[PDB]
Paper text:
Here we go beyond the mesoscopic polymorphisms of amyloids from human lysozyme and HEWL, providing unprecedented evidence at the atomic level for the different folding motifs in the irreversible and reversible amyloids derived from a single protein sequence, by combining atomic force microscopy (AFM), cryo-electron microscopy (cryo-EM) and solid-state NMR. By combining atomic force microscopy, cryo-electron microscopy and solid-state NMR, we show that a full unfolding of the native protein precursor is a requirement for establishing irreversible amyloid fibrils. In contrast, under the longer heat-treatment in the presence of a reducing agent, native lysozyme undergoes a complete unfolding, which allows it to fold into irreversible fibrils, with twelve and ten in-register inter-molecular β-sheets for human lysozyme and HEWL, respectively.
We also report the structure of hen egg-white lysozyme irreversible amyloids at 3.2 Å resolution, revealing another canonical amyloid fold, and reaffirming that irreversible amyloids undergo a complete conversion of the native protein into the cross-β structure. Following a similar strategy, we also solved the structure of the irreversible fibrils of HEWL that were prepared under the same conditions as the human lysozyme fibrils. In details, the HEWL amyloid fibril structure comprises residues 26-101 and is composed of 11 inter-molecular in-register β-sheets (β1: residues 28-30, β2: 33-38, β3: 43-45, β4: 51-52, β5: 55-62, β6: 73-76, β7: 80-83, β8: 89-92, β9: 93-98 and two β-strands, of 6 and 4 residues with unknown sequence composition). The β-strands are sometimes bordered by Gly residues (i.e., Gly26, Gly49, Gly54, Gly71, Gly102), by prolines (i.e., Pro79) or β-arches. There are asparagine ladders (such as the buried Asn37, Asn59, Asn74, and Asn77 [which is buried because there is another undefined β-strand close by as highlighted in Fig. 3f]). Neither their overall folds, the sequence locations of the β-strands, nor the core hydrophobic and charged interactions are similar. While the 3D structure of the irreversible HEWL amyloid fibril structure is largely distinct from its human analog both at the secondary structure level as well as the side chain interface between the secondary structures, once again the two sub-domains of the native fold are intertwined in the amyloid structure with the anti-parallel β-sheet segment of sub-domain B forming partially the core of the fibril structure surrounded and complemented by segments from the helical sub-domain A of the native fold.
Author numbering:
A (entry chain A), B (entry chain C), C (entry chain E), D (entry chain G), E (entry chain I): 26 to 66, 70 to 100
């Protein structure tokens, strides 16, 4: 049978006087899939490493997203 | 059967007086797939490393996205 | 069966008086796929390394995207 | 079956009075695919390295995209 | 079956009074494909290195895209 995965749907109709704002949001930041269909059978593998190492150190980031914002 | 994966759909209809703003957002920042169909069977592999090493150091970033913004 | 993956769809109809702004956003920043079809079977591989090394150092970035903005 | 991958679709109809702005955005920043069809079987490989090394150093970037902007 | 990959489609119809602006954006910054069809089987390989090394040094970039802009 058919599959929908991780799909984002948006619809807007007759919308008026609308603001949308977005600072530093994330969707689906890390996504990993294995999928076999109809198969007659050592296995698929996914890895994902995000190491941060910081020593004597400041304000480091390891990330999918990073936003730094200053407003006066 | 059919598959939809990670698809982003947007529709706008009759929209008026609309602002959209976006600072430093992310979608689907890392996406990994393995897929086999109809297959008669050492396995496919995906790796993803984002190492940050920072030593005696400042304001480093390792990322899919990085935004730095200052407004006065 | 048919597949849709990571497709971005947008539709706008009768739209009026519209602003769209986008600073430092990202979509699908890293995307990795393996796919076998109808196959009678050492395995496909994808790698992706983004290392940052910083020592005694400042404001470094290793990234798919990097945006720096100053406004007065 | 047929496949759509990483395709970006946009349609605009009867649109009026529209601004679109975009600073430093990215789509599909790194994309890697392996694909085999109808095959009777050492494996295809993709690698991608973005190393940044910075020592005693400032404001370095290793990136797919880099935008620096100043406005007064 | 047929394939669409990384295709960018745009359509504009009856559009009026339109600005589109774009500073330092990127699409499909790095794209890597391997593909075999109908094949009876040492494997194709893609590499992509973007090293930046900076020592005692300033404002270096190694990138697919780099935009620097100043406005007064």
């Amino acid at each position: 049978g058919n599959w929908v995965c991780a799909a984002k749907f948006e619809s807007n109709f007759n919308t008026q006087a609308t603001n949308r704002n977005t600072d530093g949001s994330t969707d689906y930041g890390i996504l990993q899939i294995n999928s076999r269909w109809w198969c007659n059978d050592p296995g698929s593998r996914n890895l994902c490493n995000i190491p941060c190492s910081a020593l004597l150190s400041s304000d480091i980031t390891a990330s999918v997203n990073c936003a730094k914002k200053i407003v006066s």
